[model samples]
Target: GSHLEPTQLGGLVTDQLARLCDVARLDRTDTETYVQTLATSLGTAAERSLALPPTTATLLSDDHTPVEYSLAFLPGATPALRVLVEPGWDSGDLAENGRAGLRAIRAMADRWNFSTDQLDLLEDLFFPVAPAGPFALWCALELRPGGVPGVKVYLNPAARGRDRRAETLREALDRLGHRQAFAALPPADDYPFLALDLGEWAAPRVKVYCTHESLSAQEAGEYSRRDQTTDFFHAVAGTSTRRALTCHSFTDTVTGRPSGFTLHMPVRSYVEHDGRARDRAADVLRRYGMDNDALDRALAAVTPRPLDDGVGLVAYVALVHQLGRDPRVTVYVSSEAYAVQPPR
Candidate 1:
C-alpha cells in the first residue's frame, strides 16, 4: 500500500516533474530526469525507497505514516515536489523511549551530506535544548527543477512528553535569538511541530506550527490571519469541513513579526468524497496558475475506481505565504496504498 510505480499519478509528483511543468522558475526537469535515469539503471527494484523502513508505515503521529509527498506551486515558479519523512530507529516508545533522535539526525546529516558546519551549528541552536520525542526529527527533501534537493528537519516540541511541549518550545526558540518572534505567536492549546532548514544552501527559515482540535476552516482562517489577509486564504476559507484538524504555520523568527503564516487544510477530512476532493484540488491548481488537466491525468493514473468511491485520496491542501510574497500552494496527495488512517 505504501509503494508507487513510476508510471502512476503518484509517480508524476515524484518522477515526472519535468514534463508536467514548464514554468520558467519552477523547472525540476534535471532532477526528475536524473532520478528517472537512476531508476532505469536499477530496473524494477528502483521503485523501492532507501530512506524509509517497514516500521515507518505506522509511525506515531496524527498521519501515522512517516513519509508524505506534497507539490508546491507559486505564482512565478514552475512547481516543486517535497518529501517529509519522520525517521527514527525504534518504534512506539510510549512512556519510555530513546534518544536515537539525535542518532537519527546524525544519520540524516551523513545520508544527505549536510555540511558538518551546519550539523555542528545545530547542536548549539535547539538540538541541545530539545530532547527526543516519539515522533522526532521529521525531515523534508525539497526537489525543484535544475537544483539539488533542499533539506528541512522538524522537531517535536513535546520532547519531555506532551505536557511539557509549550515549555520545551518556548525554551528552544529563546535560545535561537527569536524571543519576540515567539511572543508574536498567538497562544495555542498545542504546538504540533517546528522546523529548521539545514545545510549550507539552507535559509534561516524556522517554522512554528500550532494545532487546533475540530476547529472550523473559517475559524482557522481568522486565527491564521490575525488581522492580516490574502486572496488565497480568502478563497480556501470558503471550504466547509466535515471534520477539521487545523494547523497554522508561522515562519522566520528573525523577522520579529514572523512574516510567513500558513493554514494547512486536511482536504480529505473536509470534503465528502474523492470526487469533491479532486475538483477542489483542480480549483487550487487553476487558482494559482498550475496545470488543471494534470489533476485529471493524475487521478486516472492513481486509481481506476471512480473519484466518488472513497475519501482520504487527497491528504492536505496548504495555502502558503510570507511577507511581501504572493500566496503559494502546497497540495499533499496520498498514494492510497497505506492504512495511515482509521476506518471510514
Candidate 2:
C-alpha cells in the first residue's frame, strides 16, 4: 500500500531537511540556513507548478527515433518534476532524454524568476538520465542544512536492481555531484543497519516483521488485515521452507560478519494468529538437529511451565525451550517484541 498525502511543499521540505540534519549531524545555524534556502526553492516550484499544465512533446533521441517525454509536477511533501519517456527508447537515447529533461526543468526555473543562486543550486542537484525502465524519471531538489543541494532522482524500485540503464544514470550522478539521493543509492551499511548482537561466536536465526498496528494512523489505512498477516508473513518467508526459516539477513553487529537470518512478525498479529507461538520454538529446535522423537521429548519438557504475562502460554513453551538450550535474546534499538494474551 502506498502512503501518500497532498504535498505540503514548505513543511515537507523543511521537515525532511530537519530529519537529514539529525542523521547527518548538521548544527542549528547550518540547519536553519539550509531550511530557509530550500523552502524558497520548494515554495516557488509549488507555486509555479499550479500554472504549468501537463504537456507532452516528441524529442529526437540519439538513435534517431521520436520519443515522447512528458513533463509535469507531481504533488507530494516534496515537489517532484516528472519526465516520462515513452517506451522502446535505447539506453543511450534514454540518457539523452534525461539530459533534455533537466534542460526543460532549468528553463522553467529561469522563467519562474528563480534567483541566480537558486538556479546554480538547481544545476548541482538535478541531472537527467535515461529511463531505466518504462522511460520515466523524476527530478527533485533536496537541500542540506549547509545549503548543499543534492539531486534526488525518482524511478520505479524495479528499475533499481534489474534496469541496466539505471546503473549508468546512477554512476553519472555520483560522478557529477558530490552527493545525490536516489532509490538505488548504495547502503551505508553493507550489512543490514538493524542487526542482531550475538557475541563474537554464534550466528543466530534472524526474523523481520512488519505490523499494521505499529504504523501511524495515516499509514495504517493502506494495509488491510490480509495484507498485514498472510501476505506479509509469506513475503518474508519467501522460498525458504526450512523449519527455522530465515526472515532477514544482517551482519551480526558483534561478529561484524554478514550472518544471521531471523523471523520477524508484528507482535499483535503473531499473538492473535499464533504465527510465532509453539511452531516457532519447534522450528528453532529443528535447526538444532532434533529428530521428531527428540522434538516430542523437548516439547513435553517445556510445555507445562508457567510463562510470563506479556509472553503467551503457547509462546511460553517455545521460550522455555529456547532459553534452556540456546540462551538467546532479541535485541533492538527502539523497541522489543511483545505477545498478546487471550481473555482471562
Candidate 3:
C-alpha cells in the first residue's frame, strides 16, 4: 500500500499534482497553494504568449491542456517537476508562436533572476526556415524550495519538414562545432526534439533526441552500438522493454564535444496498467539505491482507478545524464485529456 494521503487541491489543473507533494513527504497544503498561485500569474504569461487562452484556468485544464508535467528522480534527491508545453498559431505563425512562448519564458526568467541573453541566440540556432508543421517546446524549471530557479528550453530539430531533418540538424551541429560527432547517431529522421540547457548556469548543453519505436534493450543497444551505454540506459530505465525506446545525446554548447546521453521510455505503453508502471519505475529507483514509496503513491494523482486497471497515466520515463552529476530519471505523466501518443 502507498500509505500516503492526498489533500484536496481543487479542480485547478483538475489538480493533476495534488497527490505528488504528499508522495514527496512535503506539506501538501503549501504545495497546492504555491502551484495554484503560480498557475494564475506565471501560467498567464505562458497562456497569452502562446496565444492559448485568455484565462489561466482554461490554459491549465486537463481536458486538452497544452501543458504536461514530468517528475524527476535523482540518486538522492526528492522528485522534481518539469512542465512541457505546446505553442501553436493561435496568435500568429509557428515561428511567431514560439516567439510568444519565449516572451513568457523571458518574462519568467527575468523574475527568477536568470539571464535570457543567449535564449535568442539559441532560438535562431534551431528554429526552422519557415516553421511549416511542428509547434511545441519544452521548458524545464527549477521549482523546488531554496532551489535557484533555472530554465532550459527544448526545441525540434526538424520542425519545418521531415525531408530536411538531417540537413537542419547537421547545420546546427556544424554551427556548434559538433559536426564531427554527427555520424555517431543513427539517422536524422529519428530525431524530433532538440534542447538547450542554458540560463543561470555555467556550461550549457545542446541536446538531440532520437525516438526508436521499440523500448527493448536490444533495440537501444542496436542503435547506440555501445554495450556500456546500452547497459546504463536499461539500468536507469528498467529491463521492461515492452513499448518504445527514446534517447537523447548532448554536447557542450561551447566545446561541441558530446557530454551526456539520456533515455526516455513510454512507461504507460509498456505495462498492462499504471501500477505495473509504478513498480517498474520503483525497480529502477531501488537499483539506484533510492526510495520507491513516493512514486507508488504519486500514481493516484493521474488516475483514480486501481493502478492495475488504467493506462496512459504515465507518458515517459527518462534516465538523464550530466557531466559530473549522479544518474537521474524523470517520470513524465500525461494529462490523458488529448488523443496524443508519445510521438511516432
Candidate 4:
C-alpha cells in the first residue's frame, strides 16, 4: 500500500497543528517566569506607536483595548495603512467611533499638507459602513505615481447588512464630492463574502476531514475557502484554474505503460512549493520531452480539494519518492483514466 504523505492535507494539518498547540499551551509549567518573559515580548499597538508620530485616535473597546493600526510600505506600490478595531463596543457607539476615526485621519492628512482631492477620496473609502456583529473595517489610502486617488475598504465577514451599508456609504460619498470614487470600486468579486451569509460563504458538499480537532478544522476549512474560492485566488495566482502541475507521474519500469498513478498538487501547495515544483516539472519534461501544451492541459483538468493553510511539499515528495522506490508498493489508477464522467 502506498501512503499518501500527510502534507497539504488542509484540515489534517490544521487538526494536528491544533492538538500540538494545545499541548504547548498546557505544558507551560513556568507560570510566573514565563509571564515575566512574555511581558516585554509583546506590546499593544498604542504602546508600540510611541516610536512614531503621536496618533490622534484614542478609540478603545469597552474592555479598554486599544485599536490596532499600522502603515505597511511596499516597493514600487501604494503604501497601505490599516486599522483593526476590536469588537465589544455597542454597535451604535462603534459606528460613531468609526466616523470619528476617519475624521481623525483626514485631520492628519491636512496637517501633513496632503492634496484635497486625494484626501476626499480617502475620506470616501474610509467611511464607517458595517453590518451587525463583530467586524473590523480597513480603510486604505492608495497613492501611486501619476494616478487619480484610489481607495479600498475591506469589511470583515462577521458583519451583517453589508449591501445596505455599502449603498448608504456610496450615497454619503456622492454627497461629499466623490460622485465617481465609490462608483468605481473593483467588482464585488474582489470582496469575498461581502453580502453572503456566513453559512453560504464556502461551496457546499465539501467535507472537512482532519485529525483530532476535526470539527474545528472542518469549520475553519470551509471558512478559509470563502476567500480562495472567490476571484482572490485568480488575482493572486494568475491562473483561473484551481489546480497545480502534476508534481510527478508514477511509471512502471517493467511495463513502461501509463501508471495512472498521478499526483495532483493543490494551489496553496503549488504556491508554497514555489520553484521546487517548477524544477520537478522541468526535470520530467527534459527527460521525457513531453508535450508542453499536453502537460498544461493535464494539469488544468485536475481540480484540488478545498484547502485551509498551505501544506509543504517536502513531506509529499519524500513519501512519493519512498513509494516509487519500494518494489512491494502497489499503485492503482481508475480504469476510466482521466476520462471525464458526467456530473451527477
Q: What is the TM-score of each candidate against the true structure?
A: 0.70, 0.24, 0.74, 0.27
**Residue pairs clashing, model 3:** none
Candidate number achieving the greatest TM-score relative to the actual structure: 3
Candidate 2: deviation at residue 303, Å? 42
lDDT of each: 0.54, 0.30, 0.57, 0.27
Worst 10 residues of 3 by lDDT: 1-10
- Ranking of all candidate structures by their TM-score, best first: 3, 1, 4, 2
Candidate 1 C-alpha lDDT tens digits along 1-47:
22456543234334433332332234355555434432332222234
Which pairs, if any, clash in model 4? none
Let me know the TM-score candidate 1 reaches against the reference structure.
Answer: 0.70
Best by lDDT: 3
Over 1-344, each residue of candidate 4 has an lDDT whose tens digit, in order, gives 11222221212222222232222232323222222211211222212322232122322222222322222222222222222232222123546544543443444345434433423433333333543433333333222222222333333332334455555444433443334433333223212212100111121111101111111212222322132123222332333233321211212223222222112223223344323433443233333333223222222222232112222211111111123332111111111111122221
The sequence of per-residue lDDT tens digits that candidate 2 reaches over residues 1-344 is 11212243234334444444443345777667655544443323322221232122222222221211111111111111111122212224545544544454454345433332322332322233323333333333433334444332233322333433444334423332312222312221111111111112232222121212233322221221122223334432331221221223222324322222223332222443233343443454344343323323322322223323323333222111121223221211100111124423
lDDT of 3 by residue, 103-186 (tens): 667666766677665556556645655764454454655455543444677676667577777777777666555556576665
Distance from true position, residue 237, model 1, in Å? 6.6
